[PDB]
Design a protein around this ligand. Structure first.
Ligand SMILES: Nc1ncnc2c1ncn2[C@@H]1O[C@H](COP(=O)(O)OP(=O)(O)O)[C@@H](O)[C@H]1O
Ligand SMILES: Nc1ncnc2c1ncn2[C@@H]1O[C@H](COP(=O)(O)OP(=O)(O)O)[C@@H](O)[C@H]1O
Ligand SMILES: Nc1ncnc2c1ncn2[C@@H]1O[C@H](COP(=O)(O)OP(=O)(O)O)[C@@H](O)[C@H]1O
Ligand SMILES: [Mg+2]
Ligand SMILES: [Mg+2]
Ligand SMILES: [Mg+2]
Lengths: 374, 374, 374
């Protein structure tokens, strides 16, 4: 075949988004979880299967304890990650990685060890001709088809912010904020408890993740919505648990995402996301700011909440000079923006020379990740 | 011969159900009773036969006092149990236990001594190559051919409840309730007495056991049926005693099994069986409950009463979320479910390595029962 | 009189600890139980007394079914709670609550409804000039006379953990773990059953509570002590039941409290108490940790077991940096620490302005509990 295709994998914590480069959507997207049988089984002709990976784990949740192998964009446990990759290639895609160059995503400001060790695996686990490790935000910017913008990237892992002008990139300006979908989930299960509902375990932690993925939304003004919580009508929603129990969540709903804008709720000093955006933009040269204010791109799973764009618009506009208009461009299909970006990058002809080649690695070692790529 | 066959014995109190592993029904099933001649005989060329075991005792009832060696899943008297086993092997099956591995059933949450001592006997009474001691409920679940369910196990011994999901098993969730066929019998003979019929002795205690085994049934609503007892037509049934006397039992019939649902009748606080099932399910992880509500399996002799399934369905459905449908799967042939399960387990190839070997016992002692098996 | 005194009540589940503010020990401490006569009485000139409350119930146990009105720091049944409070004021203290401000304790992370409804009762049941509802852990920290520490609060209700530095308090850091004296009791009666002793009923459930309150102790290494259980000498203890029966409990003794450190025994994933303490400390700012490691305060009834402090010390030290010394401060009289703390708080002069006044409630409603107090 010509070009051999290429493979793309986005691993921020939470989800593996994988598929062939050269396609508009990934084939496989599943949760990055390694569940292990915590309870000793007593039958015969079970499994045994030491552990389960991917949406298999979601299916058989109750038995397993789940461990997310990636936290805050850092891989805690490598064998687990390897298992997840194993699952992606063999279980879903059904590819021999020897037959494809593979692109991996990775978060900014992230420890060296992760990139280096990542590469070490890809070469000396799944024998592969070539690979690349790329910054998440840039990819989403490509996916949006814009050359310039400040990409607000918040996955389940961690939140990141990378201003880009006319390509280029500003290292000093790049900001990384420790908040995530996962932190919101932890906050949320906390906030439910005041209502009586107690979710103590990893299994049901994912149930609240599911709740947040639909029921939660961001207030266009927090205090107003909280005021209107007095007369509860629309702000309460019934949710059905898999157990059959019913949950009814009012104001607690929208204050969950509020945390992004008020990390004091969580107890961290680190400024809210909008202020971090200003922190990024203010670090940039005076000249370019005009378009960065106007070209803010949101990416990653934890920007999905309804009404986030609007709130960011209102806050940034409030803070900034009203001399210039602040457009925020947040596409739907943002969740997959990183992966799409990866697809487009590996599809690019010129890119086909920038790969880290197996050969190059074998001569020069794993450390070469930083030398070559950003 | 290949595989040597294998032997299976179910001893919950009341009945010994024994036969060859690898068959769909046991060969021998007889009552676990050791009758002794209480009255001194005066002839010559009698017996003498110090005691009788199995349905022999049923045949010659009047003379003997019967002693059930097992109470509440605990063996009261070991020599008696040994005698019963003796009878099963030599009198019915006609096997040398040296030539067969033997599987025993045993109830959950049961004292260690019973398992340990049980094994001690099997090795150092009937010389046998290998053996295993297995939980009653699991076996019935196998017999039903389902991988998941909450098995409500009530024999004559005691009632037990073990939720199982996808194999696995939840120790904390396992529940053991002190009610049984035998307690119902004791209640029943009590309740007859208000009608005039007085059954004071072990002999006729078994007569009432027989009555209960057919005449008694469970109300689909207790109070309604008791109300309709005013106009007695169908609720009375003539029963013929072996004496030739006739008994006529009305409302007293169905309130006997009612006890399972209203242990206050018996005077115990311990919740009714349906509530215990909820107690089990509620102890389990939120995720799996959906299928446990739907996969409840009834086993054991004292689930045989007509209409039990229906009442359990109505009560559980009443208590639970009506969001999810509560199927109860109660096969006919449930009585023998444990034994069938044993047959299927010993028939399994892989199981053939999990046996407790004579050799292993000789090195490691009797205590190894818990170490190896559940 | 000057200052009017003030009243203090600690209701975590299990015990009501009540007395006058301004004294070093509470006057009345009795079990929070509402026993009801389950069996219909037949005499004349009995009671009748629909139910019994407090150590009255302990005295007349056999007849009654006992219901603990509080579970997991949540009041299940309000009328019952009201009855218990009734009993405290009228039966023991002999006070008119109109003549005293009353302080109540309450557990962290606890449902709003409990605080709100609690206040609703105190104002519209026992007419009272003022009241306050306070966090259990803080109170014990006061009682210990230290300004800083991480208070591990485990009653019979639930276990809680609140780090405090120089006063202040860290909401995000506060941890609440579902384990308790009551869960240990449930585990313990389970574990006895393997020995033959079967305790099926609420009455004798309290007998095992009593056993645990003395016989049980925590291993300074679990596996070592369990190993030494082979040669049983000191690890067995005879206990006398009220029935006159004697119980003999070996290794089963110490593995009961082991559960706090290995909740897998109970079947919960939730980490052990020491790990939860680390979970709390790790949530806190890097700066303060040094003194939290050094100032851990244990409170509540279910820290009473001999050897708990030592085990916590060994585990925390093992996990933490050995760069800094980990003192654990666990006073004897810890059981009463919450109540003492309450006494000292109501004694404080300035506190006398922070009360929730009857007047304030009447204008502003019950919801004001959260508004004013923590
Ligand atoms: N539909 C949704 N609405 C709101 N939040 C969502 C939704 N889907 C996912 N999330 C949140 O975003 C997270 C997924 O982020 P993801 O894009 O997988 O990050 P990454 O690409 O870095 O792995 C989830 O864990 C969840 O908290
Ligand atoms: N046909 C029947 N109808 C109703 N109840 C029955 C019937 N047969 C047996 N029982 C009750 O169930 C008991 C038998 O239980 P069994 O299955 O032998 O328990 P186990 O398997 O634990 O020994 C009897 O003692 C009797 O009380
Ligand atoms: N002397 C003791 N030794 C060991 N455990 C005890 C002792 N006394 C009480 N306990 C355990 O602690 C519990 C009492 O906790 P308590 O302090 O009343 O909690 P709270 O203050 O939240 O009500 C009892 O139920 C028992 O399990
Ligand atoms: Mg991402
Ligand atoms: Mg049985
Ligand atoms: Mg307490």
């Amino acid at each position: 075949e010509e070009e051999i295709a290429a493979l793309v994998i986005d691993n921020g914590s939470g989800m593996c988004k994988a598929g062939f480069a050269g396609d508009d959507a990934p084939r496989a997207v599943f949760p990055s979880i390694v569940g292990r049988p915590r309870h000793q089984g007593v039958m015969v002709g079970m499994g045994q299967k030491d552990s389960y990976v991917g949406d298999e784990a979601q299916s058989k949740r109750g038995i397993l304890t789940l461990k997310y192998p990636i936290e805050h964009g850092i891989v805690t446990n490598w064998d687990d990650m390897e298992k997840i990759w194993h699952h992606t290639f063999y279980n879903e895609l059904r590819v021999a990685p020897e037959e494809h160059p593979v692109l991996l995503t990775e978060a900014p400001l992230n420890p060296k060890a992760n990139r280096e060790k990542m590469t070490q695996i890809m070469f000396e686990t799944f024998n592969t001709p070539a690979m690349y490790v790329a910054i998440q935000a840039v990819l989403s910017l490509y996916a949006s088809g814009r050359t310039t913008g400040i990409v607000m990237d918040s996955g389940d892992g961690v939140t990141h912010t990378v201003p880009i002008y006319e390509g280029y990139a500003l290292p000093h300006a790049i900001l990384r904020l420790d908040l995530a979908g996962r932190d919101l989930t932890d906050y949320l299960m906390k906030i439910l408890t005041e209502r009586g509902y107690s979710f103590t375990t990893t299994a049901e932690r994912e149930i609240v993740r599911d709740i947040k993925e639909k029921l939660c939304y961001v207030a266009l003004d927090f205090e107003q919505e909280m005021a209107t919580a007095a007369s509860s009508s629309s702000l309460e929603k019934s949710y059905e648990l898999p157990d059959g129990q019913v949950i009814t969540i009012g104001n607690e709903r929208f204050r969950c995402p509020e945390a992004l804008f008020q990390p004091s709720f969580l107890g961290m000093e680190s400024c809210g996301i909008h202020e971090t955006t200003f922190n990024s933009i203010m670090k940039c040269d005076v000249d370019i700011r005009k378009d960065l204010y106007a070209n803010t791109v949101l990416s990653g799973g934890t920007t999905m909440y309804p009404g986030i764009a609007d709130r960011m618009q209102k806050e940034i506009t409030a803070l900034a000079p009203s001399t210039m208009k602040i457009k925020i461009i947040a596409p739907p299909e943002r969740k997959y923006s990183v992966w799409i970006g990866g697809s487009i990058l590996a599809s690019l002809s010129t890119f086909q020379q920038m790969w880290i080649s197996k050969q190059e690695y074998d001569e020069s070692g794993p450390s070469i990740v930083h030398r070559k790529c950003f």
